[PDB]
């Protein structure tokens, strides 16, 4: 039976026994990631261009996408605090549109290379609120294995989302004639171990000793068999979804232009974490599970390590050895 | 003023005086990628699991892909009435046109790239090389045996987070932005050049166990500046559209150099490395496969290697200059 | 504040305390009639006339529309799990769904009205009436055969200059825009509500030779006022969606009454009529056969004709009292 | 072997020996009636009703998308559209030597119900050597080198007729583009369908009058014609010209010299009638003959099949 995202997740919250609150919630994230994926094609830019006689562009995409996730969610009436990369607060919902979830995003992930039309993509972390106090920033200030769910929209050579919840995780294609998500690869796993490594490796000078010996055993490796081969788009969502789908490993760790790291713990790694995780997978700071770090503020960043678990595995025994 | 790409290719046509056949050839191709943009983007794709009861997925979707993006460049190209020889990565010997449908230009292409490149839904491109039939004999493969500088125009569609069309012909190299609502390329970037100098550089260094010595010293000397200025930062998606692009976009270097057990590299000099080399010197940047300018290459095999190393200027000439210590 | 579809039915479904069955069965609907829409705007047309060489079309591909929209709608429904016994147009028996997919739902459609002259590019259409089942024992063809006074939910999409869907509930009559570029369909009015009275009536008059009397007299009062008031225009599409559509926007009355070679009309009773009556009523409007309401007809044959005279109610009542006149 | 839109009329010019301008013409209206589908079917109303939190009227839309790519086509010097009560001139650095008037939006009357509409064109060669001024639009059609229309009806199509015919292009929205369905069309020789707006039969001419009661009954007794009236005159044309038969917007007393407009509306749809093998009359005389005095001045109509049109004029010289 074709399925799509809308029947997929109805039929989840039928069988939570929810009130359709996060029901909403989802089905306004879609709208939003729709509405996004269009712009992102560039649907309407001869008008921008003149066509009917009317005359910062990455920039503006960006804004956008910020205010089609923050509107739709706003008038979800399933949401009371917003995180976003874009927004420098934390964004507290009016009263009369108030519920008891908290979100965490990037509405347009790697935008600034857009000049180059790379993948962008955009990664959202749902959390129930826990506290009962007034809300605030601190509700959004919870670990990552308390999210209840959590995903990202790629805007590729298609428009594909994975979403991850309880039940596991399962990637839907946007099919723009009828703008529906087909459900196109159910309760993905990654493999346990992959042949491709994925960071930045311009940083060599600043690597830590660990990240050095393990990326020199993926080139060299010592009971010679095939060296892994390399791939990086530089754009998170594009880069973790390929670890996904191919298995492997992707670094972005500290360097000492960022010594806590370069990526966000609460937009970012937290939800690719959480895929990663329900995927079988496995993501690590180094000293702890990304899961497990509890935020302090809400634009903090982290290194992360994560995808096939024998790679991950592999780059904690030689970091421990490196103690 | 507004300028789309059937504007802006009729209106180099008629200050060239030219027959109009060569931009018969170009409306084609316009026409063909659209329509590998629309299936890259999964239109239709409800149709292909199920949505009105019908048919499973079976086989392999990316190479189903790869031959329909073919099929679509072959007849649109064959019903231009421009075309007497058709060069296709995809195709092991050259298409001759029927006689009907001659005309005479020849065209090198790889339609897509989606079988060459474990990316999944990451970016994927076409890339195209337009000659003039050089000879009056029976059109054969030997008329797509022109070095690189023989091109009249040349290109690619890159299938990223737009559609964007790039066209090199002699008056330079112009930049098109696919609006998929109304099927319209936009002119967005005018007689584009690269920058003398970039700071990103781009090769799959997984290979690095088999990389020729000045490959070696080269990279290390982008990672570790003995200056001490800062290091190149370094991209690599692994389609050969992606990367040229963002080297024209943002300067840098892009590097399939030869190697011990590649001597000729591994990309294909007339679908790949002379397209992307013509694109290269329009906008003021270069082409080296080491030895020698790649539009300098006289092919002997339609499906021939070249190493190339492309982008800007002084960071080819820096690499020129390692690759000859090591001479 | 920005609503959906798919928002909409969803908070109406918590309202009401459903347990998510009708609502799957609306985005169910919902999802058809986006494919619906965009075979009827002609996507993919250019591979049925060989962009891509004969090779490469058959599938969905080749269907008619009317063909085509039955395989939609008939999928999306019984994989809804929400429904048990289907009624369409285009097949002889009702089809009762298999027991793994049965909900408590019956659903009569016509997948594609107005398909007759779909070559001349007339707008064209999808109506629907939705019915809980009543019955003790297994489902079968007579659970359609309720009045349209059961109805839980009714509506259309016409396929017009633009896709609208217009859905009829116990709360009234909503409207959707369908936004192409996202594929949402875009809450647009609300509670809508038909005007008491207008000046447009709508009917076939080619078969005036054999018009009841009292449509002759009916039709004779709107061109011929007999208070020198000013003349009613005349609109016939021929397409009863865009007629009723036309009607309820902009007020009036839509004729398919019955005359002496079609004693009982043409329009089909269960999913032509009684969704449209339902829509109407819902609206402020009426709808009656000459002798009692639409609604109240109690069906005997899944596929029996039924005259329809509908519209702003001040015109249906000057109909029935010329027609109960000459009765 | 499939045909767009932009390779038919290239190769039509290049047949021409024509220099490129009207082709280049041609490409430009292409290229506006993309646009003018696109935002007809509504593309981006979620933005209108505030879908990212925060207006042009369709009519005002197409006429901008029309004019500024005429304008920027560099192929022509007079523009005369319905919503303009003046012609636009073409300032000197933009000028060619066509004269383009047009409907940019038929219909929109009532596109509130969402009818059919479309956009209608008329091409013609300016002839003088002078400053191009109103008066080069003031042609019979006769004179026009090509014209047409676009419905955006259920689907997108565009109608095109010049010299060597008539040809229908289908609007493939997966990749924006005109596909060649039916080429060289011909109407059929008789239809079955009349079509015009009997609420005005109390202003009815008698010879209307008696032709549409020979169509209810008919006089050699074969079965009467059915009707159809969309009111919008891009479909009721179209479907004209599809199935056979004829329409008839004839003199009433709101509009006692005809309703519809001589050079943007009679003028393109009369001329497509011809090259399909059809005919177009006022009554008195073909409307491809009548030689405008005024931009915006209205003609009665009656076109179609050419037994009916002909069987008109049969009962319309009977009243003479
Ligand atoms: N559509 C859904 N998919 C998966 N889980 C859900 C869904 N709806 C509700 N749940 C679960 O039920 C809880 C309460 O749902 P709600 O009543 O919608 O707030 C959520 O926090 C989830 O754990
Ligand atoms: N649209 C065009 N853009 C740029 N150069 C063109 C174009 N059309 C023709 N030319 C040039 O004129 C030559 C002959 O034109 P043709 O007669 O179309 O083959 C070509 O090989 C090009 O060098
Ligand atoms: N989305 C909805 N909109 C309006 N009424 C609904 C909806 N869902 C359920 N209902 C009402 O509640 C009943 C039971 O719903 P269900 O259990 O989903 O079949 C229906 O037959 C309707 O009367
Ligand atoms: N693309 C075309 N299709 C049909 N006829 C054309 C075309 N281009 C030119 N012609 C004919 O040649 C004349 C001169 O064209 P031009 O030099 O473009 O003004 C026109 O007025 C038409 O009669
Ligand atoms: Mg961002
Ligand atoms: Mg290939
Ligand atoms: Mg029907
Ligand atoms: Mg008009």
Redesign the pocket.
Same mark, same amino acid.
């Given at each position: 039976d074709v399925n799509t995202l809308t029947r997929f997740?109805?039929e989840?919250?039928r069988k #939570?026994?929810?009130?359709?609150?996060?029901?909403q919630l989802?089905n306004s994230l879609c709208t939003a990631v729709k509405a996004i994926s269009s712009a992102v094609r560039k649907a309407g830019i001869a008008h921008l261009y003149g066509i009917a006689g009317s005359t910062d562009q990455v920039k503006k995409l960006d804004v956008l996408s910020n205010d089609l996730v923050m509107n739709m969610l706003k008038s979800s009436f399933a949401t009371c605090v917003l995180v976003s990369e874009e927004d420098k607060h934390a964004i507290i919902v009016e009263p009369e549109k108030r519920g008891?979830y908290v979100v965490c995003f990037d509405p347009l992930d790697g935008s600034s290379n857009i000049d180059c039309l790379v993948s962008v993509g955009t990664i959202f972390g749902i959390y129930?609120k826990k506290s009962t106090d007034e809300p605030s920033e601190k509700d959004a200030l919870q670990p990552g294995r308390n999210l209840? #769910?959590a995903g990202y929209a790629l805007y590729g050579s298609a428009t594909m989302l994975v979403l991850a919840?309880?039940?596991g995780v399962n990637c839907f294609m946007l099919d723009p004639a009828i703008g529906e998500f087909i459900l196109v690869d159910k309760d993905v796993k990654i493999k346990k171990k992959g042949k491709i490594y994925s960071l930045n490796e311009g940083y060599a000078k600043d690597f830590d000793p660990a990240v050095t010996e393990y990326i020199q055993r993926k080139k060299f490796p010592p009971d010679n068999s095939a060296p892994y081969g390399a791939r990086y788009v530089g754009s998170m969502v594009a880069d973790v979804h390929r670890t996904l789908v191919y298995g492997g490993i992707f670094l972005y760790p500290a360097n000492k232009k960022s010594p806590n790291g370069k990526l966000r713990l609460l937009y970012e790694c937290n939800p690719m974490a959480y895929v990663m995780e329900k995927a079988g997978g496995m993501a690590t700071t180094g000293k702890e599970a990304v899961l497990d770090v509890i935020p302090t503020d809400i634009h903090q960043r982290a290194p992360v390590i994560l995808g096939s678990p024998d790679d991950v595995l592999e780059f904690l025994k030689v970091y421990e050895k490196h103690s």
């Open positions: 997740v109805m989840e919250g #939570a026994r929810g009130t359709g609150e996060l029901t989802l008891k129930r209840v #769910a919840m309880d039940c």
